Ligand binder design. Structure first.
Ligand SMILES: CC(C)(COP(=O)(O)OP(=O)(O)O)[C@@H](O)C(=O)NCCC(=O)NCCS
Ligand SMILES: *C(=O)CCCCCCCCCCCCC
Lengths: 8, 352
């Protein structure tokens, strides 16, 4: 919710 | 404790947001939809729905002064926000009334002008005045001594779309169709007795969650009213499915909430629908089986990706279920509470 992560 | 609000830069003013007012809730939605968190490359931005914000921001015990907005004086445009909600937090040997700080956001035009520092000091002041002197929050920014550090993992449900919008990429020697085949899921869940959570399930879900959380070092402590709030299904906000055994007793449950992201620059795809692993409790269904059915249900509901952190027991199923690690790191912080750091697998708290 605090970080918009995507696939590494 | 200071009794007057902290001074804002000239031309700006405090305004507590009445989220029960549809217009004001849409004002907050618009602020976050245009200025909240983006990925490192500014391709996606969170798109918390208005109904989600109302769910996240008015749990049992919410206070209106803790929905802390800033407006331009002349135009009344909303340009800043921060929130606190009460929560009973277990941290190692101690259970204490804290607040959860969330949704810190300053309009893009107002950044680097030292507004966020004031928002933080003001919410601190408003929480102090209620007698609460600790807080828990998360952030991507590395501040000193996080109590824990989790990493995001992602399970591709609609791999073609993810690759097309560059949320994902083709692995070495892989192709679009072969990636679609690799991430293919069954079309119906396999666990006998799996069904959406109902009102009658509130006490057993509460009891299951309370006993299951005890093994971690940082967890919520929820009343039955908080369980009802956080888990009772609401379409496009929160999904909870219980496993009812052959004698009619709920033994496990899974939950995930709905948080899509705007896709800024793609000719055809405008939104990325993501599901976020919430709390999952197993006592008779293997957790692997439980989460496999979570992926199936999310796929059925049109989600493009299933997101999870490496916290609690999640590492026991992430790779087996073809989650890929993400580029995002999430730090957990406790305000005014020193204690030893812990590995992700001892973190048992999920915020919205
Ligand atoms: C993070 C935040 C609030 C900092 O605001 P700022 O007023 O530019 O900070 P300043 O350097 O002026 O002290 C601002 O950049 C923002 O709104 N970013 C998008 C939302 C977000 O990332 N929140 C996470 C804070 S942990
Ligand atoms: C994400 O939006 C969280 C931003 C966290 C900013 C720091 C909060 C510091 C603690 C404030 C409340 C403390 C009151 C006891």
């Amino acid at each position: 919710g605090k970080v918009l992560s995507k696939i590494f | 404790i200071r009794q007057e609000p902290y001074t804002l830069p000239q031309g700006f003013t405090w305004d507590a947001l009445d989220l029960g007012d549809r217009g004001v809730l849409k004002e907050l939605y618009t602020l976050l939809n245009e200025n909240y968190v983006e990925d490192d490359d500014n391709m996606f931005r969170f798109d918390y729905s208005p109904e989600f914000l109302l769910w996240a921001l008015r749990p049992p015990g919410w206070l209106p002064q803790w929905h802390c907005g800033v407006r331009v004086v002349s135009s009344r445009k909303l340009v800043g926000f921060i929130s606190a909600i009460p929560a009973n937090i277990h941290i190692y040997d101690t259970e204490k009334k804290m607040v959860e700080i969330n949704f810190l956001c300053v309009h893009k035009k107002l950044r680097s002008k030292r507004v966020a520092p004031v928002l933080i000091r003001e919410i601190t002041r408003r929480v102090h005045l209620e007698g609460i002197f600790q807080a828990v929050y998360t952030a991507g920014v590395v501040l000193p001594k996080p109590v824990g550090t989790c990493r995001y993992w992602h399970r591709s449900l609609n791999p073609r779309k993810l690759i097309e919008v560059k949320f994902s990429h083709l692995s070495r020697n892989m192709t679009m169709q072969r990636t679609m085949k690799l991430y293919r899921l069954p079309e119906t869940p396999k666990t006998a007795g799996l069904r959406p959570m109902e009102t009658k399930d509130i006490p057993v879900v509460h009891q299951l969650l309370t006993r299951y959380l005890k093994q971690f070092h940082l967890t919520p402590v929820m009343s039955q009213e908080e369980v009802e709030h956080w888990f009772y299904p609401q379409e496009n906000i929160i999904d909870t499915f219980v496993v009812e055994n052959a004698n009619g007793e709920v033994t496990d449950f899974l939950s995930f909430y709905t948080l899509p992201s705007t896709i800024m620059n793609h000719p055809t795809h405008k939104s990325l629908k993501a599901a976020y692993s919430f709390y999952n409790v197993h006592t008779q269904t293997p957790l692997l089986d439980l989460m496999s059915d979570a992926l199936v249900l999310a796929k059925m509901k049109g989600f493009d990706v299933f997101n999870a952190l490496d916290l609690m027991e999640n590492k026991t199923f992430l790779e087996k279920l073809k989650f890929g690690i993400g580029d995002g790191n999430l730090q957990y912080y406790l305000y005014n509470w020193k204690c030893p750091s812990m590995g992700a697998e001892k973190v048992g708290l999920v915020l919205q």
